[PDB]
Amino acid sequence: NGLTDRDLCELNECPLDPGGYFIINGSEKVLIAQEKMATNTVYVFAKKD
DNA sequence: CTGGCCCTCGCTGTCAAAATTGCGGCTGGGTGTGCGCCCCCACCCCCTTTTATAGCCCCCCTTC
């Protein structure tokens, strides 16, 4: 979190690594944002079928 | 026997809904993963006594 660039290098981690991913069984797993319809809002659609 | 009319009823067309199968072609990577409850019946363990052994540990007592 608070490590500076030198501390990151000494710890064998790239300073330029953005992070934002988990490490599960050694695999860098990233969660992709999932789109969904907005909740709590009234929506009137055009079912013609 | 013949003919005019309205009736229950038999059958049909028509509309509608539920049910049904398929949705391009090759390819290359990587990465992961594999009941349930409640009851009845056999079988085994602990209840108890004895005694030696010693480290460990609970409990009560005592100190200040």
PDB file of all heavy atoms in Angstrom, chain B residues 21-35:
ATOM      1  P    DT B  21     -37.036 -30.952 -29.857  1.00  0.00           P
ATOM      2  OP1  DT B  21     -36.603 -32.375 -29.877  1.00  0.00           O
ATOM      3  OP2  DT B  21     -36.692 -30.180 -28.638  1.00  0.00           O
ATOM      4  O5'  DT B  21     -36.424 -30.194 -31.120  1.00  0.00           O
ATOM      5  C5'  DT B  21     -36.605 -30.701 -32.440  1.00  0.00           C
ATOM      6  C4'  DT B  21     -35.864 -29.846 -33.450  1.00  0.00           C
ATOM      7  O4'  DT B  21     -36.437 -28.523 -33.476  1.00  0.00           O
ATOM      8  C3'  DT B  21     -34.391 -29.708 -33.068  1.00  0.00           C
ATOM      9  O3'  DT B  21     -33.527 -29.960 -34.174  1.00  0.00           O
ATOM     10  C2'  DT B  21     -34.262 -28.272 -32.536  1.00  0.00           C
ATOM     11  C1'  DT B  21     -35.513 -27.563 -33.067  1.00  0.00           C
ATOM     12  N1   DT B  21     -36.139 -26.555 -32.126  1.00  0.00           N
ATOM     13  C2   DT B  21     -36.557 -25.339 -32.652  1.00  0.00           C
ATOM     14  O2   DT B  21     -36.539 -25.086 -33.836  1.00  0.00           O
ATOM     15  N3   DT B  21     -37.035 -24.442 -31.750  1.00  0.00           N
ATOM     16  C4   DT B  21     -37.117 -24.592 -30.401  1.00  0.00           C
ATOM     17  O4   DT B  21     -37.599 -23.719 -29.688  1.00  0.00           O
ATOM     18  C5   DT B  21     -36.639 -25.875 -29.882  1.00  0.00           C
ATOM     19  C7   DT B  21     -36.675 -26.155 -28.408  1.00  0.00           C
ATOM     20  C6   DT B  21     -36.159 -26.784 -30.765  1.00  0.00           C
ATOM     21  P    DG B  22     -31.933 -29.948 -33.965  1.00  0.00           P
ATOM     22  OP1  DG B  22     -31.354 -30.957 -34.885  1.00  0.00           O
ATOM     23  OP2  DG B  22     -31.656 -30.079 -32.517  1.00  0.00           O
ATOM     24  O5'  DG B  22     -31.503 -28.488 -34.454  1.00  0.00           O
ATOM     25  C5'  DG B  22     -31.546 -28.163 -35.837  1.00  0.00           C
ATOM     26  C4'  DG B  22     -31.202 -26.706 -36.102  1.00  0.00           C
ATOM     27  O4'  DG B  22     -32.170 -25.831 -35.482  1.00  0.00           O
ATOM     28  C3'  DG B  22     -29.821 -26.346 -35.564  1.00  0.00           C
ATOM     29  O3'  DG B  22     -28.933 -25.979 -36.625  1.00  0.00           O
ATOM     30  C2'  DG B  22     -30.081 -25.209 -34.580  1.00  0.00           C
ATOM     31  C1'  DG B  22     -31.530 -24.781 -34.833  1.00  0.00           C
ATOM     32  N9   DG B  22     -32.225 -24.500 -33.575  1.00  0.00           N
ATOM     33  C8   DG B  22     -32.324 -25.339 -32.487  1.00  0.00           C
ATOM     34  N7   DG B  22     -32.970 -24.813 -31.480  1.00  0.00           N
ATOM     35  C5   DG B  22     -33.296 -23.531 -31.919  1.00  0.00           C
ATOM     36  C6   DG B  22     -33.985 -22.476 -31.255  1.00  0.00           C
ATOM     37  O6   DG B  22     -34.479 -22.483 -30.130  1.00  0.00           O
ATOM     38  N1   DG B  22     -34.079 -21.352 -32.032  1.00  0.00           N
ATOM     39  C2   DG B  22     -33.614 -21.242 -33.306  1.00  0.00           C
ATOM     40  N2   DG B  22     -33.845 -20.081 -33.892  1.00  0.00           N
ATOM     41  N3   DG B  22     -32.979 -22.211 -33.956  1.00  0.00           N
ATOM     42  C4   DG B  22     -32.845 -23.323 -33.198  1.00  0.00           C
ATOM     43  P    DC B  23     -27.401 -25.600 -36.325  1.00  0.00           P
ATOM     44  OP1  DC B  23     -26.602 -25.863 -37.548  1.00  0.00           O
ATOM     45  OP2  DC B  23     -26.993 -26.293 -35.088  1.00  0.00           O
ATOM     46  O5'  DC B  23     -27.442 -24.029 -36.031  1.00  0.00           O
ATOM     47  C5'  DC B  23     -27.762 -23.067 -37.035  1.00  0.00           C
ATOM     48  C4'  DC B  23     -27.936 -21.695 -36.394  1.00  0.00           C
ATOM     49  O4'  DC B  23     -29.101 -21.654 -35.544  1.00  0.00           O
ATOM     50  C3'  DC B  23     -26.777 -21.353 -35.482  1.00  0.00           C
ATOM     51  O3'  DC B  23     -25.677 -20.791 -36.213  1.00  0.00           O
ATOM     52  C2'  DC B  23     -27.404 -20.336 -34.529  1.00  0.00           C
ATOM     53  C1'  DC B  23     -28.871 -20.750 -34.470  1.00  0.00           C
ATOM     54  N1   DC B  23     -29.244 -21.418 -33.181  1.00  0.00           N
ATOM     55  C2   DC B  23     -30.122 -20.780 -32.283  1.00  0.00           C
ATOM     56  O2   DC B  23     -30.586 -19.679 -32.556  1.00  0.00           O
ATOM     57  N3   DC B  23     -30.443 -21.393 -31.143  1.00  0.00           N
ATOM     58  C4   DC B  23     -29.922 -22.562 -30.852  1.00  0.00           C
ATOM     59  N4   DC B  23     -30.282 -23.117 -29.710  1.00  0.00           N
ATOM     60  C5   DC B  23     -29.001 -23.223 -31.710  1.00  0.00           C
ATOM     61  C6   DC B  23     -28.680 -22.613 -32.849  1.00  0.00           C
ATOM     62  P    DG B  24     -24.181 -21.292 -35.935  1.00  0.00           P
ATOM     63  OP1  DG B  24     -24.048 -22.778 -35.776  1.00  0.00           O
ATOM     64  OP2  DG B  24     -23.511 -20.498 -34.851  1.00  0.00           O
ATOM     65  O5'  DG B  24     -23.423 -20.941 -37.286  1.00  0.00           O
ATOM     66  C5'  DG B  24     -23.835 -21.597 -38.497  1.00  0.00           C
ATOM     67  C4'  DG B  24     -22.691 -21.530 -39.469  1.00  0.00           C
ATOM     68  O4'  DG B  24     -22.311 -20.158 -39.638  1.00  0.00           O
ATOM     69  C3'  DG B  24     -21.428 -22.195 -38.970  1.00  0.00           C
ATOM     70  O3'  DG B  24     -21.457 -23.576 -39.278  1.00  0.00           O
ATOM     71  C2'  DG B  24     -20.363 -21.491 -39.795  1.00  0.00           C
ATOM     72  C1'  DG B  24     -20.923 -20.092 -39.942  1.00  0.00           C
ATOM     73  N9   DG B  24     -20.310 -19.125 -39.045  1.00  0.00           N
ATOM     74  C8   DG B  24     -20.692 -18.684 -37.806  1.00  0.00           C
ATOM     75  N7   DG B  24     -19.885 -17.780 -37.312  1.00  0.00           N
ATOM     76  C5   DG B  24     -18.918 -17.617 -38.291  1.00  0.00           C
ATOM     77  C6   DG B  24     -17.786 -16.774 -38.322  1.00  0.00           C
ATOM     78  O6   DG B  24     -17.400 -15.979 -37.458  1.00  0.00           O
ATOM     79  N1   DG B  24     -17.070 -16.928 -39.505  1.00  0.00           N
ATOM     80  C2   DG B  24     -17.405 -17.780 -40.523  1.00  0.00           C
ATOM     81  N2   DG B  24     -16.599 -17.790 -41.589  1.00  0.00           N
ATOM     82  N3   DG B  24     -18.467 -18.574 -40.502  1.00  0.00           N
ATOM     83  C4   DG B  24     -19.174 -18.435 -39.362  1.00  0.00           C
ATOM     84  P    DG B  25     -20.464 -24.577 -38.528  1.00  0.00           P
ATOM     85  OP1  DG B  25     -20.803 -25.999 -38.856  1.00  0.00           O
ATOM     86  OP2  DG B  25     -20.354 -24.253 -37.067  1.00  0.00           O
ATOM     87  O5'  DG B  25     -19.051 -24.270 -39.168  1.00  0.00           O
ATOM     88  C5'  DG B  25     -18.911 -24.415 -40.588  1.00  0.00           C
ATOM     89  C4'  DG B  25     -17.503 -24.031 -40.930  1.00  0.00           C
ATOM     90  O4'  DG B  25     -17.367 -22.604 -40.893  1.00  0.00           O
ATOM     91  C3'  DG B  25     -16.507 -24.489 -39.898  1.00  0.00           C
ATOM     92  O3'  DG B  25     -16.289 -25.873 -40.101  1.00  0.00           O
ATOM     93  C2'  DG B  25     -15.326 -23.613 -40.283  1.00  0.00           C
ATOM     94  C1'  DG B  25     -16.021 -22.293 -40.553  1.00  0.00           C
ATOM     95  N9   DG B  25     -16.029 -21.415 -39.393  1.00  0.00           N
ATOM     96  C8   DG B  25     -16.811 -21.362 -38.269  1.00  0.00           C
ATOM     97  N7   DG B  25     -16.454 -20.417 -37.435  1.00  0.00           N
ATOM     98  C5   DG B  25     -15.363 -19.822 -38.048  1.00  0.00           C
ATOM     99  C6   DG B  25     -14.551 -18.748 -37.625  1.00  0.00           C
ATOM    100  O6   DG B  25     -14.643 -18.080 -36.588  1.00  0.00           O
ATOM    101  N1   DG B  25     -13.547 -18.475 -38.550  1.00  0.00           N
ATOM    102  C2   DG B  25     -13.354 -19.151 -39.727  1.00  0.00           C
ATOM    103  N2   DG B  25     -12.341 -18.751 -40.498  1.00  0.00           N
ATOM    104  N3   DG B  25     -14.114 -20.160 -40.130  1.00  0.00           N
ATOM    105  C4   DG B  25     -15.087 -20.438 -39.241  1.00  0.00           C
ATOM    106  P    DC B  26     -15.381 -26.714 -39.092  1.00  0.00           P
ATOM    107  OP1  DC B  26     -15.571 -28.183 -39.243  1.00  0.00           O
ATOM    108  OP2  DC B  26     -15.396 -26.226 -37.680  1.00  0.00           O
ATOM    109  O5'  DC B  26     -13.977 -26.352 -39.704  1.00  0.00           O
ATOM    110  C5'  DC B  26     -12.840 -26.569 -38.882  1.00  0.00           C
ATOM    111  C4'  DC B  26     -11.758 -25.636 -39.335  1.00  0.00           C
ATOM    112  O4'  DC B  26     -12.303 -24.331 -39.608  1.00  0.00           O
ATOM    113  C3'  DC B  26     -10.716 -25.387 -38.272  1.00  0.00           C
ATOM    114  O3'  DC B  26      -9.842 -26.505 -38.236  1.00  0.00           O
ATOM    115  C2'  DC B  26     -10.119 -24.100 -38.805  1.00  0.00           C
ATOM    116  C1'  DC B  26     -11.380 -23.350 -39.190  1.00  0.00           C
ATOM    117  N1   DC B  26     -11.981 -22.624 -38.060  1.00  0.00           N
ATOM    118  C2   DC B  26     -11.398 -21.427 -37.670  1.00  0.00           C
ATOM    119  O2   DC B  26     -10.402 -21.036 -38.289  1.00  0.00           O
ATOM    120  N3   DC B  26     -11.908 -20.755 -36.618  1.00  0.00           N
ATOM    121  C4   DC B  26     -12.978 -21.230 -35.980  1.00  0.00           C
ATOM    122  N4   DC B  26     -13.452 -20.528 -34.966  1.00  0.00           N
ATOM    123  C5   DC B  26     -13.596 -22.440 -36.374  1.00  0.00           C
ATOM    124  C6   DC B  26     -13.067 -23.101 -37.410  1.00  0.00           C
ATOM    125  P    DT B  27      -9.372 -27.114 -36.833  1.00  0.00           P
ATOM    126  OP1  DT B  27      -8.680 -28.424 -36.967  1.00  0.00           O
ATOM    127  OP2  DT B  27     -10.525 -27.118 -35.879  1.00  0.00           O
ATOM    128  O5'  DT B  27      -8.314 -26.072 -36.280  1.00  0.00           O
ATOM    129  C5'  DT B  27      -7.420 -25.462 -37.220  1.00  0.00           C
ATOM    130  C4'  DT B  27      -6.805 -24.264 -36.559  1.00  0.00           C
ATOM    131  O4'  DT B  27      -7.726 -23.158 -36.503  1.00  0.00           O
ATOM    132  C3'  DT B  27      -6.473 -24.487 -35.106  1.00  0.00           C
ATOM    133  O3'  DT B  27      -5.312 -25.292 -35.022  1.00  0.00           O
ATOM    134  C2'  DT B  27      -6.249 -23.051 -34.674  1.00  0.00           C
ATOM    135  C1'  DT B  27      -7.338 -22.310 -35.432  1.00  0.00           C
ATOM    136  N1   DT B  27      -8.526 -22.037 -34.616  1.00  0.00           N
ATOM    137  C2   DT B  27      -8.528 -20.910 -33.828  1.00  0.00           C
ATOM    138  O2   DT B  27      -7.597 -20.128 -33.784  1.00  0.00           O
ATOM    139  N3   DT B  27      -9.657 -20.737 -33.077  1.00  0.00           N
ATOM    140  C4   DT B  27     -10.762 -21.557 -33.043  1.00  0.00           C
ATOM    141  O4   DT B  27     -11.714 -21.268 -32.323  1.00  0.00           O
ATOM    142  C5   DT B  27     -10.691 -22.719 -33.891  1.00  0.00           C
ATOM    143  C7   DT B  27     -11.853 -23.664 -33.902  1.00  0.00           C
ATOM    144  C6   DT B  27      -9.592 -22.901 -34.630  1.00  0.00           C
ATOM    145  P    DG B  28      -4.886 -25.939 -33.625  1.00  0.00           P
ATOM    146  OP1  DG B  28      -3.783 -26.931 -33.806  1.00  0.00           O
ATOM    147  OP2  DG B  28      -6.043 -26.444 -32.823  1.00  0.00           O
ATOM    148  O5'  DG B  28      -4.280 -24.704 -32.837  1.00  0.00           O
ATOM    149  C5'  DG B  28      -3.213 -23.964 -33.451  1.00  0.00           C
ATOM    150  C4'  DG B  28      -2.885 -22.813 -32.543  1.00  0.00           C
ATOM    151  O4'  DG B  28      -3.932 -21.831 -32.628  1.00  0.00           O
ATOM    152  C3'  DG B  28      -2.828 -23.221 -31.086  1.00  0.00           C
ATOM    153  O3'  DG B  28      -1.494 -23.619 -30.806  1.00  0.00           O
ATOM    154  C2'  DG B  28      -3.223 -21.932 -30.383  1.00  0.00           C
ATOM    155  C1'  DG B  28      -4.270 -21.371 -31.325  1.00  0.00           C
ATOM    156  N9   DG B  28      -5.627 -21.817 -31.040  1.00  0.00           N
ATOM    157  C8   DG B  28      -6.307 -22.892 -31.548  1.00  0.00           C
ATOM    158  N7   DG B  28      -7.527 -23.005 -31.087  1.00  0.00           N
ATOM    159  C5   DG B  28      -7.653 -21.937 -30.218  1.00  0.00           C
ATOM    160  C6   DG B  28      -8.754 -21.546 -29.429  1.00  0.00           C
ATOM    161  O6   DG B  28      -9.861 -22.091 -29.343  1.00  0.00           O
ATOM    162  N1   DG B  28      -8.465 -20.398 -28.696  1.00  0.00           N
ATOM    163  C2   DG B  28      -7.270 -19.721 -28.728  1.00  0.00           C
ATOM    164  N2   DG B  28      -7.171 -18.633 -27.957  1.00  0.00           N
ATOM    165  N3   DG B  28      -6.230 -20.087 -29.470  1.00  0.00           N
ATOM    166  C4   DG B  28      -6.497 -21.195 -30.188  1.00  0.00           C
ATOM    167  P    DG B  29      -1.117 -24.321 -29.418  1.00  0.00           P
ATOM    168  OP1  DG B  29       0.272 -24.894 -29.383  1.00  0.00           O
ATOM    169  OP2  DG B  29      -2.198 -25.225 -28.897  1.00  0.00           O
ATOM    170  O5'  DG B  29      -1.105 -23.052 -28.481  1.00  0.00           O
ATOM    171  C5'  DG B  29      -1.683 -23.189 -27.184  1.00  0.00           C
ATOM    172  C4'  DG B  29      -1.664 -21.846 -26.512  1.00  0.00           C
ATOM    173  O4'  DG B  29      -2.612 -20.971 -27.153  1.00  0.00           O
ATOM    174  C3'  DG B  29      -2.057 -21.930 -25.052  1.00  0.00           C
ATOM    175  O3'  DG B  29      -0.834 -21.861 -24.346  1.00  0.00           O
ATOM    176  C2'  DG B  29      -2.934 -20.704 -24.850  1.00  0.00           C
ATOM    177  C1'  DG B  29      -3.592 -20.570 -26.206  1.00  0.00           C
ATOM    178  N9   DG B  29      -4.766 -21.407 -26.406  1.00  0.00           N
ATOM    179  C8   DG B  29      -4.895 -22.490 -27.236  1.00  0.00           C
ATOM    180  N7   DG B  29      -6.098 -23.002 -27.239  1.00  0.00           N
ATOM    181  C5   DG B  29      -6.810 -22.186 -26.375  1.00  0.00           C
ATOM    182  C6   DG B  29      -8.164 -22.252 -25.983  1.00  0.00           C
ATOM    183  O6   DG B  29      -9.017 -23.076 -26.333  1.00  0.00           O
ATOM    184  N1   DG B  29      -8.484 -21.230 -25.093  1.00  0.00           N
ATOM    185  C2   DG B  29      -7.610 -20.275 -24.638  1.00  0.00           C
ATOM    186  N2   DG B  29      -8.099 -19.370 -23.782  1.00  0.00           N
ATOM    187  N3   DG B  29      -6.334 -20.210 -25.005  1.00  0.00           N
ATOM    188  C4   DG B  29      -6.010 -21.187 -25.877  1.00  0.00           C
ATOM    189  P    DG B  30      -0.464 -23.002 -23.292  1.00  0.00           P
ATOM    190  OP1  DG B  30       1.012 -23.110 -23.018  1.00  0.00           O
ATOM    191  OP2  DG B  30      -1.161 -24.313 -23.533  1.00  0.00           O
ATOM    192  O5'  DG B  30      -1.180 -22.307 -22.051  1.00  0.00           O
ATOM    193  C5'  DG B  30      -1.055 -20.875 -21.912  1.00  0.00           C
ATOM    194  C4'  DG B  30      -2.176 -20.395 -21.033  1.00  0.00           C
ATOM    195  O4'  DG B  30      -3.408 -20.494 -21.767  1.00  0.00           O
ATOM    196  C3'  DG B  30      -2.327 -21.237 -19.776  1.00  0.00           C
ATOM    197  O3'  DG B  30      -2.181 -20.431 -18.619  1.00  0.00           O
ATOM    198  C2'  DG B  30      -3.737 -21.812 -19.856  1.00  0.00           C
ATOM    199  C1'  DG B  30      -4.432 -20.992 -20.920  1.00  0.00           C
ATOM    200  N9   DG B  30      -5.323 -21.825 -21.714  1.00  0.00           N
ATOM    201  C8   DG B  30      -4.978 -22.725 -22.687  1.00  0.00           C
ATOM    202  N7   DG B  30      -6.003 -23.368 -23.181  1.00  0.00           N
ATOM    203  C5   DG B  30      -7.085 -22.881 -22.466  1.00  0.00           C
ATOM    204  C6   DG B  30      -8.454 -23.211 -22.562  1.00  0.00           C
ATOM    205  O6   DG B  30      -8.990 -24.023 -23.326  1.00  0.00           O
ATOM    206  N1   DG B  30      -9.215 -22.480 -21.654  1.00  0.00           N
ATOM    207  C2   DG B  30      -8.722 -21.557 -20.769  1.00  0.00           C
ATOM    208  N2   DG B  30      -9.612 -20.956 -19.971  1.00  0.00           N
ATOM    209  N3   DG B  30      -7.435 -21.240 -20.676  1.00  0.00           N
ATOM    210  C4   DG B  30      -6.678 -21.944 -21.546  1.00  0.00           C
ATOM    211  P    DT B  31      -2.104 -21.123 -17.176  1.00  0.00           P
ATOM    212  OP1  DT B  31      -0.822 -20.796 -16.460  1.00  0.00           O
ATOM    213  OP2  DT B  31      -2.423 -22.600 -17.200  1.00  0.00           O
ATOM    214  O5'  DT B  31      -3.292 -20.367 -16.409  1.00  0.00           O
ATOM    215  C5'  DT B  31      -4.555 -20.212 -17.092  1.00  0.00           C
ATOM    216  C4'  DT B  31      -5.659 -20.670 -16.180  1.00  0.00           C
ATOM    217  O4'  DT B  31      -6.685 -21.328 -16.956  1.00  0.00           O
ATOM    218  C3'  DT B  31      -5.198 -21.670 -15.132  1.00  0.00           C
ATOM    219  O3'  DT B  31      -5.871 -21.429 -13.905  1.00  0.00           O
ATOM    220  C2'  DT B  31      -5.607 -23.008 -15.723  1.00  0.00           C
ATOM    221  C1'  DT B  31      -6.866 -22.653 -16.488  1.00  0.00           C
ATOM    222  N1   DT B  31      -7.117 -23.514 -17.652  1.00  0.00           N
ATOM    223  C2   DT B  31      -8.421 -23.797 -17.978  1.00  0.00           C
ATOM    224  O2   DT B  31      -9.370 -23.363 -17.346  1.00  0.00           O
ATOM    225  N3   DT B  31      -8.576 -24.623 -19.059  1.00  0.00           N
ATOM    226  C4   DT B  31      -7.577 -25.169 -19.840  1.00  0.00           C
ATOM    227  O4   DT B  31      -7.867 -25.888 -20.795  1.00  0.00           O
ATOM    228  C5   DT B  31      -6.234 -24.822 -19.446  1.00  0.00           C
ATOM    229  C7   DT B  31      -5.093 -25.381 -20.240  1.00  0.00           C
ATOM    230  C6   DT B  31      -6.069 -24.021 -18.384  1.00  0.00           C
ATOM    231  P    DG B  32      -5.487 -22.269 -12.597  1.00  0.00           P
ATOM    232  OP1  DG B  32      -5.267 -21.401 -11.392  1.00  0.00           O
ATOM    233  OP2  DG B  32      -4.394 -23.281 -12.837  1.00  0.00           O
ATOM    234  O5'  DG B  32      -6.834 -23.070 -12.317  1.00  0.00           O
ATOM    235  C5'  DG B  32      -8.019 -22.313 -12.007  1.00  0.00           C
ATOM    236  C4'  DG B  32      -9.202 -23.230 -12.155  1.00  0.00           C
ATOM    237  O4'  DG B  32      -9.245 -23.685 -13.515  1.00  0.00           O
ATOM    238  C3'  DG B  32      -9.114 -24.484 -11.303  1.00  0.00           C
ATOM    239  O3'  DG B  32      -9.956 -24.299 -10.175  1.00  0.00           O
ATOM    240  C2'  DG B  32      -9.614 -25.608 -12.208  1.00  0.00           C
ATOM    241  C1'  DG B  32      -9.869 -24.959 -13.558  1.00  0.00           C
ATOM    242  N9   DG B  32      -9.271 -25.680 -14.672  1.00  0.00           N
ATOM    243  C8   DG B  32      -7.942 -25.729 -15.003  1.00  0.00           C
ATOM    244  N7   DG B  32      -7.701 -26.466 -16.057  1.00  0.00           N
ATOM    245  C5   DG B  32      -8.949 -26.937 -16.433  1.00  0.00           C
ATOM    246  C6   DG B  32      -9.311 -27.787 -17.504  1.00  0.00           C
ATOM    247  O6   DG B  32      -8.573 -28.303 -18.352  1.00  0.00           O
ATOM    248  N1   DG B  32     -10.685 -28.019 -17.528  1.00  0.00           N
ATOM    249  C2   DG B  32     -11.590 -27.507 -16.632  1.00  0.00           C
ATOM    250  N2   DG B  32     -12.871 -27.847 -16.820  1.00  0.00           N
ATOM    251  N3   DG B  32     -11.255 -26.706 -15.623  1.00  0.00           N
ATOM    252  C4   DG B  32      -9.922 -26.476 -15.578  1.00  0.00           C
ATOM    253  P    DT B  33      -9.963 -25.355  -8.973  1.00  0.00           P
ATOM    254  OP1  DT B  33     -10.581 -24.812  -7.708  1.00  0.00           O
ATOM    255  OP2  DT B  33      -8.603 -25.979  -8.770  1.00  0.00           O
ATOM    256  O5'  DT B  33     -10.929 -26.506  -9.527  1.00  0.00           O
ATOM    257  C5'  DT B  33     -12.268 -26.161  -9.943  1.00  0.00           C
ATOM    258  C4'  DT B  33     -13.017 -27.444 -10.181  1.00  0.00           C
ATOM    259  O4'  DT B  33     -12.743 -27.927 -11.513  1.00  0.00           O
ATOM    260  C3'  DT B  33     -12.610 -28.546  -9.208  1.00  0.00           C
ATOM    261  O3'  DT B  33     -13.744 -29.201  -8.654  1.00  0.00           O
ATOM    262  C2'  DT B  33     -11.800 -29.519 -10.053  1.00  0.00           C
ATOM    263  C1'  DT B  33     -12.314 -29.279 -11.459  1.00  0.00           C
ATOM    264  N1   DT B  33     -11.290 -29.470 -12.497  1.00  0.00           N
ATOM    265  C2   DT B  33     -11.680 -29.987 -13.710  1.00  0.00           C
ATOM    266  O2   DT B  33     -12.835 -30.301 -13.959  1.00  0.00           O
ATOM    267  N3   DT B  33     -10.667 -30.147 -14.618  1.00  0.00           N
ATOM    268  C4   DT B  33      -9.333 -29.837 -14.440  1.00  0.00           C
ATOM    269  O4   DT B  33      -8.535 -30.033 -15.357  1.00  0.00           O
ATOM    270  C5   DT B  33      -8.996 -29.288 -13.147  1.00  0.00           C
ATOM    271  C7   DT B  33      -7.570 -28.922 -12.868  1.00  0.00           C
ATOM    272  C6   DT B  33      -9.977 -29.134 -12.247  1.00  0.00           C
ATOM    273  P    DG B  34     -13.573 -30.103  -7.340  1.00  0.00           P
ATOM    274  OP1  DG B  34     -13.118 -29.264  -6.169  1.00  0.00           O
ATOM    275  OP2  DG B  34     -12.730 -31.337  -7.560  1.00  0.00           O
ATOM    276  O5'  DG B  34     -15.079 -30.578  -7.033  1.00  0.00           O
ATOM    277  C5'  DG B  34     -15.975 -30.845  -8.143  1.00  0.00           C
ATOM    278  C4'  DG B  34     -15.826 -32.277  -8.596  1.00  0.00           C
ATOM    279  O4'  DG B  34     -14.857 -32.343  -9.658  1.00  0.00           O
ATOM    280  C3'  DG B  34     -15.347 -33.252  -7.518  1.00  0.00           C
ATOM    281  O3'  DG B  34     -16.434 -34.039  -7.041  1.00  0.00           O
ATOM    282  C2'  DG B  34     -14.301 -34.121  -8.219  1.00  0.00           C
ATOM    283  C1'  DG B  34     -14.319 -33.658  -9.667  1.00  0.00           C
ATOM    284  N9   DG B  34     -13.004 -33.603 -10.300  1.00  0.00           N
ATOM    285  C8   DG B  34     -11.802 -33.282  -9.723  1.00  0.00           C
ATOM    286  N7   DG B  34     -10.799 -33.314 -10.565  1.00  0.00           N
ATOM    287  C5   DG B  34     -11.381 -33.670 -11.774  1.00  0.00           C
ATOM    288  C6   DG B  34     -10.788 -33.862 -13.044  1.00  0.00           C
ATOM    289  O6   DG B  34      -9.595 -33.749 -13.354  1.00  0.00           O
ATOM    290  N1   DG B  34     -11.738 -34.222 -13.998  1.00  0.00           N
ATOM    291  C2   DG B  34     -13.082 -34.374 -13.759  1.00  0.00           C
ATOM    292  N2   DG B  34     -13.842 -34.724 -14.806  1.00  0.00           N
ATOM    293  N3   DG B  34     -13.646 -34.195 -12.566  1.00  0.00           N
ATOM    294  C4   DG B  34     -12.739 -33.841 -11.626  1.00  0.00           C
ATOM    295  P    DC B  35     -23.286 -34.880   1.367  1.00  0.00           P
ATOM    296  OP1  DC B  35     -22.093 -34.519   2.187  1.00  0.00           O
ATOM    297  OP2  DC B  35     -23.012 -35.047  -0.084  1.00  0.00           O
ATOM    298  O5'  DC B  35     -23.800 -36.284   1.928  1.00  0.00           O
ATOM    299  C5'  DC B  35     -24.786 -37.092   1.239  1.00  0.00           C
ATOM    300  C4'  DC B  35     -26.063 -36.338   0.898  1.00  0.00           C
ATOM    301  O4'  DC B  35     -27.043 -37.264   0.344  1.00  0.00           O
ATOM    302  C3'  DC B  35     -26.741 -35.719   2.112  1.00  0.00           C
ATOM    303  O3'  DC B  35     -27.112 -34.376   1.858  1.00  0.00           O
ATOM    304  C2'  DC B  35     -27.989 -36.573   2.329  1.00  0.00           C
ATOM    305  C1'  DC B  35     -28.304 -36.967   0.927  1.00  0.00           C
ATOM    306  N1   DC B  35     -29.231 -38.144   0.811  1.00  0.00           N
ATOM    307  C2   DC B  35     -30.619 -37.930   0.648  1.00  0.00           C
ATOM    308  O2   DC B  35     -31.083 -36.795   0.647  1.00  0.00           O
ATOM    309  N3   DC B  35     -31.431 -38.985   0.512  1.00  0.00           N
ATOM    310  C4   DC B  35     -30.947 -40.202   0.550  1.00  0.00           C
ATOM    311  N4   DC B  35     -31.801 -41.196   0.377  1.00  0.00           N
ATOM    312  C5   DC B  35     -29.558 -40.467   0.738  1.00  0.00           C
ATOM    313  C6   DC B  35     -28.738 -39.416   0.876  1.00  0.00           C
TER     314       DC B  35
END
